[PDB]
Design a protein around this ligand. Structure first.
Ligand SMILES: *Cc1cc2c(cc1C)nc1c(=O)[nH]c(=O)nc-1n2C[C@H](O)[C@H](O)[C@H](O)COP(=O)(O)OP(=O)(O)OC[C@H]1O[C@@H](n2cnc3c(N)ncnc32)[C@H](O)[C@@H]1O
Ligand SMILES: *Cc1cc2c(cc1C)nc1c(=O)[nH]c(=O)nc-1n2C[C@H](O)[C@H](O)[C@H](O)COP(=O)(O)OP(=O)(O)OC[C@H]1O[C@@H](n2cnc3c(N)ncnc32)[C@H](O)[C@@H]1O
Ligand SMILES: CCCCCCCCCCCC[N+](C)(C)CCCS(=O)(=O)O
Ligand SMILES: CCCCCCCCCCCC[N+](C)(C)CCCS(=O)(=O)O
Ligand SMILES: O=C(Nc1cccc(F)c1)c1coc2ccccc2c1=O
Ligand SMILES: O=C(Nc1cccc(F)c1)c1coc2ccccc2c1=O
Lengths: 499, 494
């Protein structure tokens, strides 16, 4: 019934918010729709796998908030296997490599790839993390899709195909589905292309020992009975002195303030009194989540390592069900496994199949890419299609179609009377990730602390000390990377000389 | 409590479905979220206006279902005034014209405009009304926006500005927001460019005497206490023998079947048990409605008619708050008024202003376009910003961003166990309109009658006899319109 703050949603964002508020001495309640906490994180436990992350899993350098939160809760990380060679599989053949970017030998294609990644970051530097709609060309860039941008930028099919994979993998959406402005913002707010694509020194460096679901679970243990499971929120009434929050199972909660810690569009599942202001009313119908099936195939041994492959496969084109894999073997070397994503339209297309049919297509793919008959001998399989989740809407995160971020983006974390907005979507650093969930939950909690006169305004946004356990190597470029011409740059140089 | 069919939503679609089911002898209940029926139609009555449609208003030839339903309920139509000249206002000057398409005189611009309209209809001929995702180039066209298509097709800024206005006015959305496939389908399923843009012999020919809200009101009158107002549906449970439908005010309704007659995305306001299938779960997050403020400025007299202007203004460019107007005067020449739409991004931009500030901007625009100081002397004003509506999501209808129609379009009218889907968005002819609302409501009702064994499969979709009161005249083209080259066509020859 009565409390200081109701937090709607018990994912990492809502739990981080509730914890901060609880630690500050307030009375918080967390209302969670599901029979579990963690949301878009979910750690399955059984005897065949021990534990496995079926939702969000990876953490890495520069994600200091999630690292700090997890460390405080008694959790540890380990490094995702990247000892041996990565594979880029292109036009039916595998090309092993080292370093984060799949390399290319053809001089023209080399210039085109170099320019593609460089230009993503060049454009990113024009986009403020906390206000992407303030970019000087925000309108122009928001009114084109990523498909249009790649069609203009990539002078080779090689670069276009890799760039397309990059978009699909980063945002679980097609290049023609997403705004160029929003995509460029998304990458820049993770620290740019190198940081977002890298295992070693990037976003995919590490996993939590025992699964990421422990973050939300251990906060629930700290909060005790303040977390209410199977309480989907249906109604928020701000017409009276205290806010009234009603759940589907016929309970009413009364609070001074509310934190909405659910994906933005999932706000539609709540009926509001008074109605939401116009811009938010429409925004929450314009912001879908992407589409992904996360699939883990288990093997007797991590046999790929014996061929000097680390387990990372980057697999171009249409026929492959999975475009990206990582080694998911436990740090101890057992429960050998390959994690792969079925992305964007393929998550829709292949959902028609049975679990056994998907397993077979994945093993056949892995056998070809790894040149290994052992890939046809799985011992176990787990998967999760996040498109089917009523209380997520998709994974990893919300994407913005063309035109939406400039028209509606400014209201994403704008309070609505006594409702404040958390959720990874409202973060300014690693939005879309567990890191962003912590940033947003803690920031929303401090907004309320400020509204209550407990902290000054300059304490709402708080910097985070660098992790001593996961130091961040800087992102660097070479002279040639900075100054080599694009393909059209080279052609201009050719035209000028012959004159 | 217990009934045969629960209809969620008391707009035209839900009302049409409930009426059909009721007339066949089933016990129906309509659960309506608002304190009124009509949904995206809303007729306001007061002494100053008599009545005014602040939502959907226009009907025309080929919309035989809405015309038949309205006639049965005792309604009459009158013609939107198009006796005098239309105005196209371009680069600060008014150019009066007759006929539906704003004309041009420059030979290159002429070829470009001609080709633009012709191409929209050429592309439409390959898009099945009942399955646009089966177009031969469905993927190619769905993966581009209308902005990309227009940038490719229009060699002149003149044609591109008019085409942009056309898109904005048709679908209350920006060219870059919408799938080209979806937009081309939308036009084709209203009978093509001429039919969709025309007042005389098209979609804007007529209005209902006393307002379109009377359709939904008069069905509510027939149904009596079967219509439950202020019953927003929050929960649908299909796990047991009968379907259970719960409302926000705590009531529980039990039925054999349910019709969802709400905009597709407003399905998100309902919690489902079991969860919806994957494709629908995601679809209902991918389908926004457009943005519009409908504004009606009243005057002492329809003064524009004295200058041989009918009151239609087509107003290009960014600065104008309103891109399109029609004469809203009543049939007797009284309650003189101009109806104008503030479209798409301008609805968002100008919503910050006060009502009085919007009135001043509109009057000054109209004074310029009509070339009359009389436009600065309004006697009354009414407006409605549909972007504010929790239980509509916007107006006129749902648009599909790039990539969505091909991936999720099949899902829209697919039943989910014992839930069938009505709403104008599910129609195959004049989807987006009151006509499509009737088509979809009656079809969803007949799906349930078929499920019950009461009618055969072949009676689910029913043709409609042509209205005697509003007959359609054929859409024609000239030899030169059909065969003149495009701009790049003319360049190939040179
Ligand atoms: C799904 C997924 C996500 C993911 C990823 C791979 C997959 C398959 N990989 C990631 C990774 O490797 N590293 C990483 O940092 N992130 C990764 N992601 C994304 C990550 O999981 C998310 O960014 C993050 O978990 C989101 O946290 P947040 O707290 O912002 O949101 P949530 O988890 O969705 O929590 C929302 C909770 O709210 C409940 N809910 C929903 N509606 C209601 C109502 N009406 N009432 C009450 N509760 C509600 C949800 O049930 C959920 O628990
Ligand atoms: C808004 C608008 C619409 C419009 C237009 C101009 C404007 C500003 N001009 C039109 C025109 O000149 N001619 C024409 O034929 N159409 C025009 N349009 C569109 C037209 O109004 C619509 O196509 C039509 O009204 C749609 O009817 P439909 O019955 O399909 O949908 P609806 O009116 O939105 O009705 C839905 C009802 O459902 C209720 N609702 C919503 N959620 C719930 C829940 N959860 N529970 C119960 N009821 C719910 C709504 O309140 C509504 O009444
Ligand atoms: C004649 C030249 C045609 C090559 C087009 C190459 N792409 C990459 C398709 C477009 C370049 C765009 S831009 O021209 O750099 O703006
Ligand atoms: C010149 N515009 C119309 C800008 C492009 C023609 C596109 S295309 O060359 O016909 O593809
Ligand atoms: O862009 C990525 N990786 C990537 C790795 C190699 C080449 C390439 F083009 C892209 C990733 C982006 O975001 C993610 C989110 C959750 C899990 C993995 C990833 C990526 O690997
Ligand atoms: O396209 C339209 N009209 C139009 C009329 C003249 C020139 C032009 F480019 C467009 C209309 C489209 O759909 C509508 C929907 C509700 C009300 C009016 C209209 C139109 O007039």
């Amino acid at each position: 019934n009565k409390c200081d703050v109701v937090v709607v949603g018990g994912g990492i964002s809502g739990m981080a918010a509730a914890k901060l508020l609880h630690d500050s001495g307030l009375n918080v309640v967390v209302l969670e729709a599901r029979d579990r906490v963690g949301g878009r994180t979910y750690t399955l436990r059984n005897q065949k796998v021990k534990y496995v992350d079926l939702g969000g899993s990876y953490v890495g350098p520069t994600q200091n908030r999630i690292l700090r939160l997890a460390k405080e809760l008694g959790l540890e990380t380990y490094k995702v296997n990247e000892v041996e060679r990565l594979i880029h599989h292109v036009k039916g053949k595998s090309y092993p490599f080292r370093g984060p970017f799949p390399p290319v030998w053809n001089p023209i294609t080399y210039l085109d790839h170099n320019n593609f990644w460089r230009t993503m970051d060049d454009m990113g530097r024009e986009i403020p993390s906390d206000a992407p709609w303030k970019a000087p060309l925000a309108e122009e860039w928001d009114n084109m899709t990523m498909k249009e941008l790649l069609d203009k930028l990539c002078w080779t099919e090689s670069a276009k195909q890799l760039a397309t994979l990059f978009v699909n993998l980063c945002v679980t959406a097609e290049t023609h589905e997403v705004s160029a402005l929003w995509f460029l913002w998304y990458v820049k707010q993770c620290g740019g292309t190198t940081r977002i694509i890298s295992t070693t020194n990037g976003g995919q460096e590490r996993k939590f020992v025992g699964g990421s679901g422990q973050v939300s679970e251990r906060i629930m243990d700290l909060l005790g009975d303040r977390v209410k499971l199977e309480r989907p929120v249906i109604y928020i009434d701000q017409t009276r002195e205290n806010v009234l929050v009603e759940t589907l199972n016929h309970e009413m909660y009364e609070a001074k303030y509310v934190i909405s810690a659910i994906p933005p569009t999932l706000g539609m599942k709540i009926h509001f009194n008074p109605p939401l202001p116009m811009m938010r009313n429409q925004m929450i119908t314009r912001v879908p989540l992407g589409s992904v099936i996360k699939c883990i195939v288990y093997y007797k041994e991590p046999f790929w390592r014996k061929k000097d492959y680390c387990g990372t496969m980057i697999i171009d084109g249409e026929e492959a069900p999975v475009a990206y894999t990582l080694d998911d073997t436990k740090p101890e070397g057992n429960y050998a496994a390959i994690m792969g994503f079925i992305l964007a339209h393929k998550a829709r297309k292949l959902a028609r199949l049975t679990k056994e049919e998907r397993l077979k297509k994945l093993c056949e793919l892995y056998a070809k890419v790894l040149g290994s008959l052992e890939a046809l001998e799985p011992v176990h399989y787990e998967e999760k299609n996040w498109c089917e989740e009523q209380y997520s809407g998709g994974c990893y995160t919300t994407y913005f179609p063309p035109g939406i971020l400039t028209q509606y983006g400014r209201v994403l974390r704008q309070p609505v009377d006594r409702i404040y907005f958390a959720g990874t979507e409202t973060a300014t650093h690693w939005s879309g990730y567990m890191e962003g969930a912590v940033e947003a939950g803690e920031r929303a909690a401090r907004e309320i602390l400020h509204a209550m006169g407990k902290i000054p305004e300059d304490e709402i946004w708080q910097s985070e000390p660098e992790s001593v356990d996961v130091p961040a190597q800087p992102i660097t470029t070479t002279f040639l990377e900075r100054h080599l011409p694009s393909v059209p740059g080279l052609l201009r140089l050719i035209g000028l000389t012959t004159i």
